[PDB]
Amino acid sequence: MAGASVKVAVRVRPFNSREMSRDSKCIIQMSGSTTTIVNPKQPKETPKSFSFDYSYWSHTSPEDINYASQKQVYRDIGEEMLQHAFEGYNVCIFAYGQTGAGKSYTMMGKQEKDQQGIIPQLCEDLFSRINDTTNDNMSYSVEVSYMEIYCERVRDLLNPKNKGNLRVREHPLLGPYVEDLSKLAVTSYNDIQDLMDSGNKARTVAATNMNETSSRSHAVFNIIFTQKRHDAETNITTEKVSKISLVDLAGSERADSTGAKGTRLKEGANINKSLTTLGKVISALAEMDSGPNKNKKKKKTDFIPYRDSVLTWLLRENLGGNSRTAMVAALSPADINYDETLSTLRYADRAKQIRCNAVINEDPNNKLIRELKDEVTRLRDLLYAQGLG
Amino acid sequence: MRECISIHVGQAGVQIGNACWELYCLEHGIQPDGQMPSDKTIGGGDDSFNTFFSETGAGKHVPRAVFVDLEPTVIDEVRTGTYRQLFHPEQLITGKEDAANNYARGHYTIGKEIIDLVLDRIRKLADQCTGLQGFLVFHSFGGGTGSGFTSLLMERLSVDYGKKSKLEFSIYPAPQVSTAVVEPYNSILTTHTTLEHSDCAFMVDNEAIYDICRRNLDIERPTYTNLNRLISQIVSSITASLRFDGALNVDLTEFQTNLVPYPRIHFPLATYAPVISAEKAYHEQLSVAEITNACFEPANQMVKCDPRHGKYMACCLLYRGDVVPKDVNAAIATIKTKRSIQFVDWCPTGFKVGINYQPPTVVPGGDLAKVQRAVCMLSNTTAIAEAWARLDHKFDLMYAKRAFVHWYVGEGMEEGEFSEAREDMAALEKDYEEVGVDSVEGEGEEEGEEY
Amino acid sequence: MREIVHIQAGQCGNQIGAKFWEVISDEHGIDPTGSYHGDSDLQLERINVYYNEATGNKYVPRAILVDLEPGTMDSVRSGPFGQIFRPDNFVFGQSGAGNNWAKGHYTEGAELVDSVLDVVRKESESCDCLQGFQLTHSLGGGTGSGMGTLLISKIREEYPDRIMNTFSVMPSPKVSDTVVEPYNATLSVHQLVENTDETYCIDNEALYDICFRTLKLTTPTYGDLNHLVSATMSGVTTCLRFPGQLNADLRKLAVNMVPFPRLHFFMPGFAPLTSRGSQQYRALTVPELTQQMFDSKNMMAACDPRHGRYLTVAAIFRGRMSMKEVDEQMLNVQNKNSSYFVEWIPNNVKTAVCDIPPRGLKMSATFIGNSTAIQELFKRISEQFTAMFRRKAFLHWYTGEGMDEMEFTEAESNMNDLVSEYQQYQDATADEQ
Ligand SMILES: CC(=O)O[C@H]1C(=O)[C@@]2(C)[C@H]([C@H](OC(=O)c3ccccc3)[C@]3(O)C[C@H](OC(=O)[C@H](O)[C@@H](NC(=O)c4ccccc4)c4ccccc4)C(C)=C1C3(C)C)[C@]1(OC(C)=O)CO[C@@H]1C[C@@H]2O
Ligand SMILES: Nc1nc2c(ncn2[C@@H]2O[C@H](COP(=O)(O)OP(=O)(O)OP(=O)(O)O)[C@@H](O)[C@H]2O)c(=O)[nH]1
Ligand SMILES: Nc1ncnc2c1ncn2[C@@H]1O[C@H](COP(=O)(O)OP(=O)(O)NP(=O)(O)O)[C@@H](O)[C@H]1O
Ligand SMILES: Nc1nc2c(ncn2[C@@H]2O[C@H](COP(=O)(O)OP(=O)(O)O)[C@@H](O)[C@H]2O)c(=O)[nH]1
Ligand SMILES: [Mg+2]
């Protein structure tokens, strides 16, 4: 077996038309692997500072210095994970972010094909390498499935039948799976995107006090990739099978923001429970990865609470074992949503928690005064030590 | 008219209210059915004091009280008890399940659908009131209703009324003793509302009262009735200054003005000096000096924290009975010379004094002796930080593994609401550690110009 | 008004339910005809928790009785309290499950479940504010285990936000009455772990030990064991029906006892229990009840707590008593046996006090523990399960009713995962690397 490190990425977004028209001010600053946020109503106290692995300032589109270009993000996550998948190991992207955060742009990108998301670049690179390396001996097959999780019940997004609750089973060797989940082959990435649009049309969406169309459920797009090898014999062997998972996570809601009763509160509670369990398993896996990776001791196998939710149960193979993980969080850049943004950071801080310390914005006047005082002290000490004053 | 509205939330609040209203009815000669034979016998007077009772035309007296709970049991015990005819038939009881020791259940899910009725009744009481002074909220940390619903109620009251004072009596969890597994979560989560919205929060501890009721009042097996009676005596000592005459009279605003150096440190301790049994009431002079000294004894504190580990920032002494100002001055002078009692260097005065002529009453069937003098001391000090620090440690030991968390998130909260609250708690602790430090040596570093 | 719907399936469930309705009925003063002939007034205030009010000043329990054979219905009707129940709640068929879990879950119970759910829905729609459900059944049996699991699945589907207790009589090593116990036990606990908020652990060996050693009964019978289980069943929900100094609802127990969703298997106990003639020789006080509650031989699950650690414990006292004594005794128990309590919970003792004790005793107490030692009760079953599954000892009886070999493997895996989850907290430190 092997561990599975997790890459924590956070990205802002350039203002939108409504934001631009209004006089709203930005509130998020980002430098290196650190971000800081200022409370608009408490300018006096302090800014909250968090430190991630990967930090991306996509605020100023025409910026030339320290602009988080889309190709940069793709090279920094998706290329490495696709290479890992080609070696024959399962990999996964979680996409977290509340309404207005801008998760969809990062995950899919614009249809103009000038600014891409992670999914189109991954699919294009996969199929380019498939066509490039298809020699006489090697064969490649790709299949796609798209499911939805709602109130701890699985539903099919591609099959147009009645939205019944599918049954979750556990094959002894192939692990957890879902019965009657339609599985389809695809020849071009255009087919993949068409299927994605068709499934996204079928997502369970309800109107809230915040937005009229907010996702009420999780969604998983699995790309199943099979490599067949033809050695110099009569035996053709399916050498490895690997999975690429694209999980869309709904945000975390508060009952105060959405005071609706009945189905709405049930959906919110289920979403919060699933997100908490997902964070717990990811944190445990990151800790277990970090430990052996340096110490190389096998502390039994610990216990990873996979079964506490259907989401972590179905993604059991992808998360655990020899695999790769990466979570991307979108942070709206306005202020009106300040608390929301903070919550996102607090969810993106979870797992692989690392030390950030306090970021202090010094007054330039006091900085210059202190520097000049130090210079005067040094020069005076040098002069008086030699008896020249 | 100096008038206050008492709000009782949760089981602890309702039972403390039972004790308090027994004491008030005994104090003012009001019968359990609301009638006062004293006025009929004498002819008239002000014995229908407007602080706690509103008088109707027929001569009945209705308390200015609001009881709230999510269970029907504790209030159904009052609707069919001895005082069933004293209270207005409203009691604001949600005929549903309880908060179930869950802050989120009492603040988000089930706290709604009952807050509106409570606020409507509070507004109805306030409309009848002239010259309202403040609110007296009784609750308990560690409970579901008493934490979450109290937080919601305090937030809404601060939004609505704003300027009126809001005094809070609360039962902080004990260090070792407890009656629930998830006390730290609720107690920490209540920090937000008990900090920003309340004006002065008095904390009492069950372990301290058990210790008192075993060394002083020699009882070996106490129940909650004794604790509620002692707390009722404390509240009566606090509120006596706007019901009866006295040489020096202290209103509710003077309390806040004298005991609160900064807005964020309004957590004073409270103590009652002449806690003694009838048998030991003899063999004891019980002079002003003795009770004043006993107020400062660490053993007699109502919260398990040692004052010697901190510094006193303010004190407020409320005397009752045959007390003369000269003896109070002598006692304060004697206390100021002791070395074990350290005051912060930036508060040279450090004492508020109030004297009231009305002596304390004796509840029939009670445990306290009849005495001629009494004193209640409030002390804003830095030792309270210790009482918080232990709790924080406990919280960490449960939040590292995220135990019991899914119950809270299943009712409408999120994980972050934990951590934020903890951070806020840390800030409060640091604030105390900032204020108890002595002023830096020659606070203008050093000085001295030519001449 | 908190109210509870009671369900009883199978022979063991019906017997325990009948005894339970006789124990609760006395406490609340109910004539076997149904009229009220009590003395106190605190007995009718919360009568609606368990009873509906009929027209002619008569009270009918909310019991629902399920079976796949009419014999146990006939036994219950021809009994001391047979006429108390509503005859429309006697749901039953014929050609019983034959101690086959598949028949109870897939073939025979699938036809009677619709009628049982119709009755349950009719009963629950009349509730002012339904709190939760109770189900009494045996894991090692036929119709009981399968029908109970199928029902619990359906009600959890229909009422996801309501508590679901369960008093389960699971098999025991020495006192084994049927040869296919492990299959039924595994296939049942595969379902109970998913769709139940609280499960109480009972087995006949522990109750026999209590009868022989504590009560010194020469020839105990099933009536006694049911009498105990009934005592525990009332003591759990005493606080819902009566006032007290510090109340404790079912949801409070669930919140305070369950740290994580899958660890909800509890060890029940009751005190005081003496052997008639010894009564005069011992005084009744809070320390005596505390000592008897935590005694290993008093437990009703046949799992020694000394082999593990208590994740949580709850104590519901009934009687006039001092809160200081209760708190000091719980603190003393925690501080003395410090090795048997988990370190990362600062205080793991819930305490509740009810004012009015059981009729006949000045003091009583119920204990609900939650400890890692429960893993043993699963492990043994799993061992026996594999000892029968490697050779497929009686598998054709199950696969002939629509089941498949995969389901047994999923159930075994779920048992093993639950055992590991409970075992992770058992060891008394984690320092080395
Ligand atoms: C008169 C008296 O005080 O004698 C006791 C008595 O001697 C003892 C031995 C009783 C007696 O119990 C037994 O002998 C017994 C036999 C088999 C299984 C269980 C018990 C008693 O029968 C049990 C009986 O208990 C009750 O009456 C409670 O209400 C009890 N309910 C019933 O027993 C009951 C059964 C059928 C119909 C109606 C009531 C109860 C306890 C807890 C919660 C709810 C109900 C009492 C007081 C006694 C006797 C009569 C000897 C004991 O039982 C209980 C639960 O109290 C057994 O050890 C305890 C300790 C008691 O001291
Ligand atoms: N001093 C004192 N404390 C009490 C009394 N009753 C309850 N308490 C305290 O209350 C705590 C339990 O939480 P509660 O305040 O009762 O919670 P609640 O008000 O019943 O609200 P729920 O949790 O929803 O039931 C215990 O730890 C006690 O310390 C009392 O009569 N006197
Ligand atoms: N890096 C970026 N550069 C430029 N524009 C961006 C960037 N990120 C996001 N955007 C803008 O964000 C818009 C999409 O935002 P939107 O679809 O509302 O996010 P969202 O719907 O809240 N995500 P979600 O609801 O969680 O699926 C795009 O049309 C872009 O204009
Ligand atoms: N306590 C108790 N246990 C019983 C009783 N009858 C059967 N059992 C237990 O239940 C198991 C048999 O299950 P059974 O009742 O036949 O299940 P059913 O066929 O579905 O009703 C045995 O292992 C017994 O230990 C009873 O009257 N009381
Ligand atoms: Mg309560």
PDB file of C-alpha atoms in Angstrom, chain B residues 136-270:
ATOM      1  CA  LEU B 136     -32.595  40.116  35.345  1.00  0.00           C
ATOM      2  CA  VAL B 137     -31.942  37.014  33.230  1.00  0.00           C
ATOM      3  CA  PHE B 138     -31.505  33.682  35.027  1.00  0.00           C
ATOM      4  CA  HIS B 139     -30.083  30.734  33.097  1.00  0.00           C
ATOM      5  CA  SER B 140     -27.335  28.115  33.265  1.00  0.00           C
ATOM      6  CA  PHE B 141     -24.357  27.315  31.079  1.00  0.00           C
ATOM      7  CA  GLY B 142     -24.111  23.722  29.915  1.00  0.00           C
ATOM      8  CA  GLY B 143     -27.813  23.305  29.193  1.00  0.00           C
ATOM      9  CA  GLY B 144     -29.425  23.345  25.793  1.00  0.00           C
ATOM     10  CA  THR B 145     -32.210  25.851  26.379  1.00  0.00           C
ATOM     11  CA  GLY B 146     -30.358  27.948  28.954  1.00  0.00           C
ATOM     12  CA  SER B 147     -27.461  28.515  26.540  1.00  0.00           C
ATOM     13  CA  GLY B 148     -28.919  28.743  23.038  1.00  0.00           C
ATOM     14  CA  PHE B 149     -32.299  30.263  23.819  1.00  0.00           C
ATOM     15  CA  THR B 150     -30.712  32.686  26.274  1.00  0.00           C
ATOM     16  CA  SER B 151     -28.265  33.721  23.549  1.00  0.00           C
ATOM     17  CA  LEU B 152     -31.073  34.331  21.058  1.00  0.00           C
ATOM     18  CA  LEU B 153     -33.162  36.217  23.622  1.00  0.00           C
ATOM     19  CA  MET B 154     -30.251  38.425  24.679  1.00  0.00           C
ATOM     20  CA  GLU B 155     -29.410  39.238  21.056  1.00  0.00           C
ATOM     21  CA  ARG B 156     -33.000  40.208  20.257  1.00  0.00           C
ATOM     22  CA  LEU B 157     -33.348  42.249  23.457  1.00  0.00           C
ATOM     23  CA  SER B 158     -30.128  44.129  22.700  1.00  0.00           C
ATOM     24  CA  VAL B 159     -31.448  44.847  19.206  1.00  0.00           C
ATOM     25  CA  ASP B 160     -34.828  46.057  20.478  1.00  0.00           C
ATOM     26  CA  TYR B 161     -34.309  47.962  23.739  1.00  0.00           C
ATOM     27  CA  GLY B 162     -30.579  48.649  23.500  1.00  0.00           C
ATOM     28  CA  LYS B 163     -29.918  51.168  26.260  1.00  0.00           C
ATOM     29  CA  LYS B 164     -31.555  49.384  29.209  1.00  0.00           C
ATOM     30  CA  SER B 165     -29.238  47.413  31.473  1.00  0.00           C
ATOM     31  CA  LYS B 166     -29.204  43.608  31.284  1.00  0.00           C
ATOM     32  CA  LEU B 167     -27.898  41.836  34.388  1.00  0.00           C
ATOM     33  CA  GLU B 168     -27.255  38.101  34.065  1.00  0.00           C
ATOM     34  CA  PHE B 169     -27.089  35.456  36.797  1.00  0.00           C
ATOM     35  CA  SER B 170     -25.695  32.175  35.496  1.00  0.00           C
ATOM     36  CA  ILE B 171     -24.500  28.821  36.827  1.00  0.00           C
ATOM     37  CA  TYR B 172     -21.005  28.253  35.476  1.00  0.00           C
ATOM     38  CA  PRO B 173     -19.956  24.577  35.257  1.00  0.00           C
ATOM     39  CA  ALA B 174     -17.910  23.313  38.169  1.00  0.00           C
ATOM     40  CA  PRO B 175     -14.281  22.192  37.736  1.00  0.00           C
ATOM     41  CA  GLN B 176     -14.750  18.527  38.724  1.00  0.00           C
ATOM     42  CA  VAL B 177     -18.496  18.003  39.224  1.00  0.00           C
ATOM     43  CA  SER B 178     -20.799  17.918  36.214  1.00  0.00           C
ATOM     44  CA  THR B 179     -24.129  16.460  35.094  1.00  0.00           C
ATOM     45  CA  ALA B 180     -23.569  16.194  31.333  1.00  0.00           C
ATOM     46  CA  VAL B 181     -20.940  15.086  28.841  1.00  0.00           C
ATOM     47  CA  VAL B 182     -21.248  18.097  26.482  1.00  0.00           C
ATOM     48  CA  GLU B 183     -21.082  20.942  29.006  1.00  0.00           C
ATOM     49  CA  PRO B 184     -17.874  22.510  27.560  1.00  0.00           C
ATOM     50  CA  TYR B 185     -19.303  22.926  24.051  1.00  0.00           C
ATOM     51  CA  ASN B 186     -22.375  24.871  25.174  1.00  0.00           C
ATOM     52  CA  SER B 187     -20.438  26.838  27.792  1.00  0.00           C
ATOM     53  CA  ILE B 188     -17.829  27.948  25.247  1.00  0.00           C
ATOM     54  CA  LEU B 189     -20.429  28.715  22.575  1.00  0.00           C
ATOM     55  CA  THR B 190     -22.316  30.990  24.982  1.00  0.00           C
ATOM     56  CA  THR B 191     -19.237  33.250  25.272  1.00  0.00           C
ATOM     57  CA  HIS B 192     -20.230  35.311  22.211  1.00  0.00           C
ATOM     58  CA  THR B 193     -23.589  36.429  23.582  1.00  0.00           C
ATOM     59  CA  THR B 194     -22.628  36.611  27.256  1.00  0.00           C
ATOM     60  CA  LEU B 195     -19.726  38.886  26.245  1.00  0.00           C
ATOM     61  CA  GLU B 196     -21.081  41.326  23.687  1.00  0.00           C
ATOM     62  CA  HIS B 197     -24.728  41.763  24.692  1.00  0.00           C
ATOM     63  CA  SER B 198     -24.852  41.492  28.496  1.00  0.00           C
ATOM     64  CA  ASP B 199     -23.746  44.368  30.740  1.00  0.00           C
ATOM     65  CA  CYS B 200     -22.786  42.502  33.934  1.00  0.00           C
ATOM     66  CA  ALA B 201     -22.660  38.717  34.352  1.00  0.00           C
ATOM     67  CA  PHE B 202     -22.579  37.128  37.807  1.00  0.00           C
ATOM     68  CA  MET B 203     -21.247  33.565  37.935  1.00  0.00           C
ATOM     69  CA  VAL B 204     -22.002  31.000  40.641  1.00  0.00           C
ATOM     70  CA  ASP B 205     -20.750  27.433  41.026  1.00  0.00           C
ATOM     71  CA  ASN B 206     -22.471  24.399  42.507  1.00  0.00           C
ATOM     72  CA  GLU B 207     -19.312  22.952  44.079  1.00  0.00           C
ATOM     73  CA  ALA B 208     -18.656  26.163  46.011  1.00  0.00           C
ATOM     74  CA  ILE B 209     -22.212  26.278  47.351  1.00  0.00           C
ATOM     75  CA  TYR B 210     -22.020  22.607  48.341  1.00  0.00           C
ATOM     76  CA  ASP B 211     -18.801  23.356  50.229  1.00  0.00           C
ATOM     77  CA  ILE B 212     -20.429  26.334  51.963  1.00  0.00           C
ATOM     78  CA  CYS B 213     -23.520  24.316  52.897  1.00  0.00           C
ATOM     79  CA  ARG B 214     -21.257  21.763  54.596  1.00  0.00           C
ATOM     80  CA  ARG B 215     -18.852  23.952  56.577  1.00  0.00           C
ATOM     81  CA  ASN B 216     -21.160  26.878  57.437  1.00  0.00           C
ATOM     82  CA  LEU B 217     -24.862  25.805  57.444  1.00  0.00           C
ATOM     83  CA  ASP B 218     -24.063  22.336  58.772  1.00  0.00           C
ATOM     84  CA  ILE B 219     -26.035  20.307  56.167  1.00  0.00           C
ATOM     85  CA  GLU B 220     -24.447  17.048  54.943  1.00  0.00           C
ATOM     86  CA  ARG B 221     -26.870  16.153  52.137  1.00  0.00           C
ATOM     87  CA  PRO B 222     -28.028  19.343  50.391  1.00  0.00           C
ATOM     88  CA  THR B 223     -30.323  19.538  47.370  1.00  0.00           C
ATOM     89  CA  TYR B 224     -30.954  22.222  44.762  1.00  0.00           C
ATOM     90  CA  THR B 225     -33.470  23.982  47.032  1.00  0.00           C
ATOM     91  CA  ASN B 226     -30.711  25.226  49.348  1.00  0.00           C
ATOM     92  CA  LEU B 227     -28.628  26.463  46.408  1.00  0.00           C
ATOM     93  CA  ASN B 228     -31.622  28.295  44.964  1.00  0.00           C
ATOM     94  CA  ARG B 229     -32.401  29.870  48.340  1.00  0.00           C
ATOM     95  CA  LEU B 230     -28.839  31.162  48.746  1.00  0.00           C
ATOM     96  CA  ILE B 231     -28.855  32.570  45.207  1.00  0.00           C
ATOM     97  CA  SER B 232     -32.214  34.182  45.984  1.00  0.00           C
ATOM     98  CA  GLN B 233     -30.684  35.824  49.050  1.00  0.00           C
ATOM     99  CA  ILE B 234     -27.879  37.174  46.843  1.00  0.00           C
ATOM    100  CA  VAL B 235     -30.342  38.618  44.321  1.00  0.00           C
ATOM    101  CA  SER B 236     -32.491  40.122  47.078  1.00  0.00           C
ATOM    102  CA  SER B 237     -29.409  41.787  48.554  1.00  0.00           C
ATOM    103  CA  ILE B 238     -28.604  43.188  45.105  1.00  0.00           C
ATOM    104  CA  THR B 239     -32.131  44.501  44.478  1.00  0.00           C
ATOM    105  CA  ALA B 240     -33.041  45.733  47.982  1.00  0.00           C
ATOM    106  CA  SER B 241     -31.560  49.178  47.340  1.00  0.00           C
ATOM    107  CA  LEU B 242     -34.507  50.216  45.102  1.00  0.00           C
ATOM    108  CA  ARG B 243     -37.311  48.880  47.343  1.00  0.00           C
ATOM    109  CA  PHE B 244     -36.481  50.101  50.879  1.00  0.00           C
ATOM    110  CA  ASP B 245     -34.912  53.183  52.433  1.00  0.00           C
ATOM    111  CA  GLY B 246     -31.303  53.408  53.550  1.00  0.00           C
ATOM    112  CA  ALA B 247     -28.470  55.732  54.450  1.00  0.00           C
ATOM    113  CA  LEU B 248     -26.575  55.087  51.189  1.00  0.00           C
ATOM    114  CA  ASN B 249     -28.679  53.824  48.288  1.00  0.00           C
ATOM    115  CA  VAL B 250     -27.170  52.092  45.239  1.00  0.00           C
ATOM    116  CA  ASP B 251     -29.190  51.764  42.034  1.00  0.00           C
ATOM    117  CA  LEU B 252     -28.561  49.308  39.198  1.00  0.00           C
ATOM    118  CA  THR B 253     -26.620  51.803  37.069  1.00  0.00           C
ATOM    119  CA  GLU B 254     -24.174  52.520  39.903  1.00  0.00           C
ATOM    120  CA  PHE B 255     -23.284  48.815  39.914  1.00  0.00           C
ATOM    121  CA  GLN B 256     -22.162  48.949  36.285  1.00  0.00           C
ATOM    122  CA  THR B 257     -20.494  52.339  36.721  1.00  0.00           C
ATOM    123  CA  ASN B 258     -18.369  51.171  39.664  1.00  0.00           C
ATOM    124  CA  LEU B 259     -17.609  47.489  38.891  1.00  0.00           C
ATOM    125  CA  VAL B 260     -16.828  47.626  35.135  1.00  0.00           C
ATOM    126  CA  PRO B 261     -13.500  49.349  34.299  1.00  0.00           C
ATOM    127  CA  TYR B 262     -13.702  48.283  30.633  1.00  0.00           C
ATOM    128  CA  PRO B 263     -16.611  46.895  28.590  1.00  0.00           C
ATOM    129  CA  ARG B 264     -15.161  43.377  28.187  1.00  0.00           C
ATOM    130  CA  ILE B 265     -14.348  42.502  31.836  1.00  0.00           C
ATOM    131  CA  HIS B 266     -17.854  42.507  33.342  1.00  0.00           C
ATOM    132  CA  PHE B 267     -17.638  39.160  35.171  1.00  0.00           C
ATOM    133  CA  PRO B 268     -17.614  39.823  38.930  1.00  0.00           C
ATOM    134  CA  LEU B 269     -17.854  37.241  41.690  1.00  0.00           C
ATOM    135  CA  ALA B 270     -20.519  37.389  44.407  1.00  0.00           C
TER     136      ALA B 270
END
